[PDB]
């Protein structure tokens, strides 16, 4: 259970972007139901007042809690990836249009999930913005967590992989356009009951042998991590 409480952009908190320039659904439930229109942005997908300006080149961090503000971020139970999307603001997030920026699951060294790491990190993620066409564009930030992915919901609507999907409106504004935006997977259709990282045992199958759900991340992806950018207690 965990939400976006805004981004920050090159260090530089944006501000508290609630139902303002995140789509923000009313809870921190998890989606899991792998065929409804709710995988695209969550439970309230609706256009929001703002987008956040950002340029080529920048790094964009998107920031989750789970109560409150730099709280215990999401409980330590919810083992599993983080991925981050983009696609065209016109698209509405519809179509083959979501480009995967960023792929994490688990760290071999560290013994550490994304989650995991994410915690530690005060609910901090980020991408680099690419080199893609000016305009606007949905960055869909998205976690899954597996405590309960040894069921499909299909079959047990009581359990499944629990998804944590947050849309944040964001503007390019300068870029060179020297990787124009391919096309992407749609969400939903991406994930089905088959494919590799939605169905797993995190008791009994090594964390190692753990593949996420493609698809693979874009070459024209500039980069990405888990890691806190920006005290927010400064504020
Ligand atoms: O006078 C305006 C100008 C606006 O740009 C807007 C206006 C009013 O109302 C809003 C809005 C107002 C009050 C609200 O409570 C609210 O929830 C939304 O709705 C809508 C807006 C909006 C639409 C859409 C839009 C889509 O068709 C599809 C989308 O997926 C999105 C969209 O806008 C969003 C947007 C929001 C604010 C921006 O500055 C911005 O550049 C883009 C975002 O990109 C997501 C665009 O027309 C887009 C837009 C307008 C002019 C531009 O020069 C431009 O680059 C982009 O603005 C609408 O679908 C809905 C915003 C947005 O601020
Ligand atoms: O009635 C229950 C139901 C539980 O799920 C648990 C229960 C009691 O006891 C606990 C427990 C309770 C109080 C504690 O103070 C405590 O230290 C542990 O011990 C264990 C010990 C275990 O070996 C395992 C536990 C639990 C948890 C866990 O909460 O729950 C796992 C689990 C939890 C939720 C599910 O939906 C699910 O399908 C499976 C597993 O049954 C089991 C386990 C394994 O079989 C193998 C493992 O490698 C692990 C395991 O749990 C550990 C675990 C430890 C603490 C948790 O809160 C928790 O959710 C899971 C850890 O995840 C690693
Ligand atoms: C899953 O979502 C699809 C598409 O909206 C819907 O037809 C189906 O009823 C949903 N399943 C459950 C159990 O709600
Ligand atoms: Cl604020
Ligand atoms: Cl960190
Ligand atoms: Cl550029
Ligand atoms: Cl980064
Ligand atoms: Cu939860």
Same mark, same amino acid.
């Given at each position: 259970?965990?939400?976006?409480?805004?981004?920050?952009?090159?260090?530089?908190?944006?501000?508290?972007?609630?139902?303002?320039?995140?789509?923000?659904?009313?809870?921190?439930?998890?989606?899991?139901?792998?065929?409804?229109?709710?995988?695209?942005?969550?439970?309230?997908?609706?256009?929001?007042?703002?987008?956040?300006?950002?340029?080529?080149?920048?790094?964009?961090?998107?920031?989750?809690?789970?109560? #409150?503000?730099?709280? &215990?971020?999401?409980?330590?139970? *919810?083992?599993?990836?983080?991925? @981050?999307?983009?696609?065209? +603001?016109?698209?509405?997030?519809?179509?083959?249009?979501?480009?995967?920026?960023?792929?994490?699951?688990?760290?071999?060294?560290?013994? #550490?999930?994304?989650? &995991?790491?994410?915690?530690?990190? *005060?609910?901090?993620?980020?991408? @680099?913005?690419?080199?893609? +066409?000016?305009?606007?564009?949905?960055?869909?930030?998205?976690?899954?967590?597996?405590?309960?992915?040894?069921?499909?919901?299909?079959?047990?609507?009581?359990?499944?992989?629990?998804?944590?999907?947050?849309?944040?409106?964001?503007?390019?504004?300068?870029?060179?356009?020297?990787?124009?935006?391919?096309?992407?997977?749609?969400?939903?259709?991406?994930?089905?009951?088959?494919?590799?990282?939605?169905?797993?045992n995190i008791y009994t199958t090594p964390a190692t042998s753990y593949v996420a759900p493609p698809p693979s991340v874009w070459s024209g992806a500039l980069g990405g991590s888990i890691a806190q950018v920006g005290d927010a207690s400064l504020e």
């Amino acid at each position: 259970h965990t939400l976006v409480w805004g981004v920050w952009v090159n260090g530089v908190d944006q501000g508290d972007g609630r139902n303002i320039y995140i789509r923000s659904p009313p809870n921190n439930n998890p989606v899991k139901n792998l065929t409804s229109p709710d995988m695209t942005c969550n439970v309230d997908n609706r256009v929001v007042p703002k987008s956040v300006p950002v340029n080529a080149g920048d790094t964009l961090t998107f920031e989750w809690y789970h109560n #409150t503000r730099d709280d &215990d971020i999401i409980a330590s139970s *919810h083992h599993g990836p983080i991925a @981050v999307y983009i696609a065209p +603001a016109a698209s509405n997030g519809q179509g083959n249009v979501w480009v995967k920026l960023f792929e994490d699951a688990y760290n071999v060294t560290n013994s #550490t999930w994304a989650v &995991d790491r994410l915690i530690t990190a *005060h609910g901090q993620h980020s991408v @680099v913005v690419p080199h893609v +066409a000016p305009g606007d564009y949905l960055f869909r930030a998205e976690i899954i967590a597996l405590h309960e992915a040894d069921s499909l919901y299909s079959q047990n609507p009581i359990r499944g992989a629990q998804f944590y999907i947050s849309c944040a409106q964001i503007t390019i504004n300068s870029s060179d356009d020297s990787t124009p935006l391919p096309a992407g997977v749609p969400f939903p259709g991406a994930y089905t009951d088959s494919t590799p990282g939605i169905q797993f045992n995190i008791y009994t199958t090594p964390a190692t042998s753990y593949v996420a759900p493609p698809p693979s991340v874009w070459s024209g992806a500039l980069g990405g991590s888990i890691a806190q950018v920006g005290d927010a207690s400064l504020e």
